[PDB]
C-alpha cells in the first residue's frame, strides 16, 4: 500500500536529496545522474521493500520515478 509515498521515500534517500526536491516526472539517467549499477542497487532495495522479484531486463528500463511505481503496482496486482 501507498507505493508513491515509499517510491518517493526510497529514491529521495538514495540520491541524498529532500523529498520536495525529487521529481517523479524527471529522467533518472541524468536528472539525478544515477548509472546502470546504481539502478541495479536500487532494484534490490525495491525487491526487499515490496517482496517482489526483478531481473536486469526489468530494472534497466526504469527511466522515470513513475516507471518504478508502475512496475511495483503491476507486480503486487499479479
Amino acid at each position: 500500500n501507498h507505493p508513491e509515498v515509499k517510491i518517493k521515500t526510497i529514491l529521495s534517500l538514495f540520491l541524498n536529496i529532500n523529498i520536495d526536491d525529487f521529481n517523479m516526472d524527471a529522467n533518472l539517467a541524468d536528472a539525478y545522474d544515477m548509472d546502470s549499477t546504481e539502478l541495479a542497487d536500487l532494484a534490490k532495495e525495491i525487491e526487499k521493500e515490496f517482496g517482489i522479484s526483478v531481473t536486469k531486463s526489468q530494472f534497466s528500463h526504469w527511466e522515470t520515478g513513475r516507471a518504478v511505481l508502475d512496475f511495483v503496482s503491476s507486480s503486487l496486482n499479479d
Binding site: 548509472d35 546502470s36 549499477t37 541495479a40 542497487d41 534490490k44 531481473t55 536486469k56 531486463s57 534497466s60
Partner: protein
C-alpha cells in the same frame, strides 16, 4: 591533437528495438542487418525489433545481432566522415566487432563465424547447465576465494574483470549459484545473475575452443587498419596467426578489461566511445580511471554529439 578510442560491447548489451532511432535517421543501419540476414537465412532486423527477447538471448542469435548492430554504428560514423580512432578494443564478442571494423575479418564472413561460434559454445555447455553472475562491491581475492570454497569438484572461476569492484563469474549453474551466495555473505554489494545462455571464458568452453581453432584456419584474416587490443592478453597483434590463436584462447581464458582500459589510457587516449547498443562499457570507464571521459553512441542524438566533439 587529442585522441579517442572506440570500445565495442559484448553479450548482455543487446535489447529489443536497438538502433530503432538511428535506423530512421540512416538507411545504412538497415542495410547492414539486411546483409547479415542473407547470411543467416532469417530477417535479423525483424528479430531484433519485434522480438521476443527470449529468442534474442539465445547465444547463436544474440551475437550476430550485436555484431550487425556494432558494425552499423561504425558504418554510420565512417559515412558521415568522423575522426579516425587511435585504438580499438572489444569486450567478449566485441573483439569480433572490433576486428570487422579494423578490416581484419570480412563482415559477411564474420556473421557465419559468430553464429557458428555460438552453436559450438552451446554444444559444450547445454541450455540450463551453466550461468553467469556479476558480483559488485567486493575485491578480487575475496571473490576468487569464494569460488574455490564452494566449487566442490565443479568448474567455477572469476572470468570478466570489468572494473575494480565489478567481477563476473561463470561455471556450472548450481556451483555459480552457490558461489554467488558466498560472495554476498563475504560483503558483496550485489550478486546479479546475467541473462546469458552460455558461461563464457571458463574451462567448460575449451571443448568448443578446440573446434573453433579449426574454423579460424579456414577463414581469411587481413591486416588491421586500426590497432585492436585483445581481451585475453591485452596486446596488439598484427599477424593473422597471432589473432587466430588469441580468439581461441579468449574463449576459455578471462577478459582483462580493467587492464585493457588502462592500456588505452597509457597511449594518450582521452575519451572512449561505446560503439554499440546500451551503455555498459561507458559506466565501467569512470570506475576504472575516473579522469577518462566516455559516452555511448547508440542513437542519432548521441551520434551527433560524439561526432561534434572529436
Amino acid at each position: 591533437m587529442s585522441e579517442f578510442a572506440m570500445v565495442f560491447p559484448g553479450q548482455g548489451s543487446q535489447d529489443l528495438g536497438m538502433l530503432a532511432d538511428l535506423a530512421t535517421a540512416f538507411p545504412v543501419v538497415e542495410q547492414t542487418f539486411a546483409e547479415a540476414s542473407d547470411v543467416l537465412g532469417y530477417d535479423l532486423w525483424a528479430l531484433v525489433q519485434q522480438g521476443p527477447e527470449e529468442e534474442l538471448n539465445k547465444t547463436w542469435q544474440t551475437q550476430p545481432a550485436l555484431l550487425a548492430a556494432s558494425v552499423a554504428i561504425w558504418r554510420v560514423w565512417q559515412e558521415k566522415g568522423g575522426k579516425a580512432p587511435s585504438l580499438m578494443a572489444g569486450h567478449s564478442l566485441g573483439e569480433y566487432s572490433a576486428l570487422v571494423c579494423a578490416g581484419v575479418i570480412d563482415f559477411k564472413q564474420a556473421i557465419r563465424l559468430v553464429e557458428l561460434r555460438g552453436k559450438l559454445m552451446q554444444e559444450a555447455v547445454p541450455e540450463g547447465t551453466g550461468a553467469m553472475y556479476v558480483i559488485i562491491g567486493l575485491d578480487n581475492e575475496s571473490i576468487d576465494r569464494a569460488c574455490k570454497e564452494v566449487a566442490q569438484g565443479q568448474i567455477v572461476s572469476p572470468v570478466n574483470f570489468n572494473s575494480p569492484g565489478q567481477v563476473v563469474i561463470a561455471g556450472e549453474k548450481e556451483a555459480v549459484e552457490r558461489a554467488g551466495d558466498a560472495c554476498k555473505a563475504a560483503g558483496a554489494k550485489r550478486a546479479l545473475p546475467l541473462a546469458v545462455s552460455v558461461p563464457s571464458h571458463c574451462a567448460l568452453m575449451k571443448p568448443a575452443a578446440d573446434k573453433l581453432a579449426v574454423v579460424l584456419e579456414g577463414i581469411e584474416f587481413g591486416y588491421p587498419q586500426f590497432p585492436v587490443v585483445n581481451n585475453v592478453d591485452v596486446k596488439i597483434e598484427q599477424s593473422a596467426e597471432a589473432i587466430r590463436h588469441a580468439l581461441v584462447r579468449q574463449l576459455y581464458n578471462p577478459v582483462r578489461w580493467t587492464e585493457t582500459v588502462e592500456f588505452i589510457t597509457e597511449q594518450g587516449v582521452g575519451q572512449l566511445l561505446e560503439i554499440g547498443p546500451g551503455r555498459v562499457l561507458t559506466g565501467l570507464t569512470k570506475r576504472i580511471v575516473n579522469t577518462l571521459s566516455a559516452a555511448a553512441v547508440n542513437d542519432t542524438a548521441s551520434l551527433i554529439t560524439a561526432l561534434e566533439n572529436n
